[PDB]
């Protein structure tokens, strides 16, 4: 069984190291990392590559040998390293949830106010909060209370003997982030549903309003110099070449509707004809007339359930047993706890498959940087 465990944990470490290391080098060779949206994924891979290369290997050695043979200093260094890193990925999931939440509730205000300097600073807070929350307590609670409670040869968080400090830090690391992430992604699911009907009624109102009134209102909004719309025009124009791709993939009747509308938009400037064309296609595709709304809402439901259940099914068994143990010490037999402590690292090997490999730009550069072609 030691050979079976060593093989299965070794493959998960090789898969995690290869999965995250390739993600870091995918957009270094590829000139498409001029995106602050991918900064959070780039930093997420930094924490998960640390877990894959350094945490799974030193934990599997801790269980297979049934012993920590690297000394107390390496135990505290590993414990601080993987608790801060797993926490950093958790608050990079919270940072990503907050970024996606404010890009759907305030798509214009948030994007205009978000700059590469600001996004990088936000990542700095996700790592600084993780650092302060975990590194001081793990590395020095044996000096806050002057005694090394951790058993020699064992390696666990040394302050978990405290009954209220454990509850507090489990709230700040898992419970509050889980409720905040669940609520934020719940409002994301609802906002996606509202965006279905909203865009549908807007698509109706393009028909009612004459095109000249829409054009004159576009000029009346693009003349008043506002940084909210100046960025919006550049973003809309930039994604025009890959927005007409979905026009071919649109409905048969809807394709003729777009073709007729762009015919009237002929002889118009590039910053106004392409800006107007994006609005019509956005409400045409995502309007969800009869069943497209259900398909898109369920698509979001499946993606969000997979993203969230990769958090509950990976972290809740660990955190539930920590809280339960604080009430009844003689509970949750050790075999259950051991499997649940390893189970947390399963998020680090699946996270690249949920946010990086889910993108179309990724999952294709991987083959270019792995097949050497």
């Amino acid at each position, epitope marked *: 069984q*030691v050979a079976f465990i060593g093989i299965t944990t070794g493959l998960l470490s090789l898969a995690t190291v290869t999965g995250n290391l390739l993600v870091l080098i995918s957009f270094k060779v590829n000139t498409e990392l001029k995106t602050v949206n991918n900064y959070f994924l780039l930093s997420l891979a930094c924490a998960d590559l640390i877990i894959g290369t350094f945490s799974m290997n030193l934990y599997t050695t*801790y269980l*297979l*040998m*049934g*012993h*920590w*043979a690297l000394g107390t200093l390496a135990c505290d260094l590993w414990l601080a390293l993987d608790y801060v890193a797993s926490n950093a990925s958790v608050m990079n999931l919270l940072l990503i949830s907050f970024d996606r939440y404010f890009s759907v509730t305030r798509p214009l205000s948030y994007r205009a106010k978000r700059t590469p300097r600001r996004a990088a600073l936000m990542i700095g807070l996700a790592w600084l909060v993780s650092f302060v929350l975990w590194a001081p307590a793990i590395l020095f609670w044996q000096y806050l209370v002057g005694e*090394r*409670t951790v*058993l*020699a*040869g*064992q*390696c*666990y*968080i040394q302050f*978990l*003997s405290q009954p209220i400090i454990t509850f507090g830090t489990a709230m700040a690391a898992f419970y509050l982030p889980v409720t905040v992430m669940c609520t934020l992604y719940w409002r994301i699911y609802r906002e996606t549903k509202r965006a279905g009907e909203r865009l549908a009624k807007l698509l109706e109102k393009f028909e009612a309003l004459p095109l000249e009134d829409i054009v004159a209102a576009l000029k009346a909004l693009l003349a008043t110099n506002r940084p909210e719309i100046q960025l919006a025009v550049k973003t809309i124009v930039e994604n025009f070449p890959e927005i007409k791709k979905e026009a071919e993939k649109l409905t048969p009747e809807q394709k003729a509707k777009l073709a007729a509308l762009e015919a009237q938009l002929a002889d118009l400037p590039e910053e106004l004809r392409k800006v107007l064309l994006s609005m019509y296609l956005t409400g045409l595709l995502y309007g969800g007339s009869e069943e497209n709304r259900k398909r898109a809402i369920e698509k979001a439901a499946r993606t969000l359930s997979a993203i969230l259940l990769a958090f509950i099914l990976t972290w809740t068994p660990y955190n539930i047993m920590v809280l339960v*143990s604080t009430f009844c*010490k*003689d509970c949750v*037999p*050790e*075999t259950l*706890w051991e499997l649940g*402590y390893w189970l947390c690292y399963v998020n680090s090997t699946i996270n690249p498959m949920c946010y990086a490999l889910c993108n179309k730009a990724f999952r294709d550069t991987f083959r270019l940087l792995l097949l050497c072609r």
Partner: nanobody
Amino acid sequence: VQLQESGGGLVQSLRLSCAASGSIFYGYYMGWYRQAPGKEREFVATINYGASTNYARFTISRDNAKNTVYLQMNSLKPEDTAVYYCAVRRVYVYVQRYYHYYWGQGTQVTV
């Protein structure tokens, strides 16, 4: 559970023992602390699952037939004198939350 260390000690190489009538010591944690005046809790050596060891000269061996340990020391120096208390049921327990019945009785090894 009572941890009766069967090794008296006072050997001027030696051989310690600890017969602790336990229920589940498989896949657990057996060890020894050389509790001397210098340090109240000092690492000595530990057997464990997989028959892997880790010292602080000596040798420590396992036996799962009767839940027993043999700290077969070799060429022990005079500084090795201490009160070795058995430490099974450490089980490298996370937050010692299952059963730390490890304390037991301590020997008197004099070198």
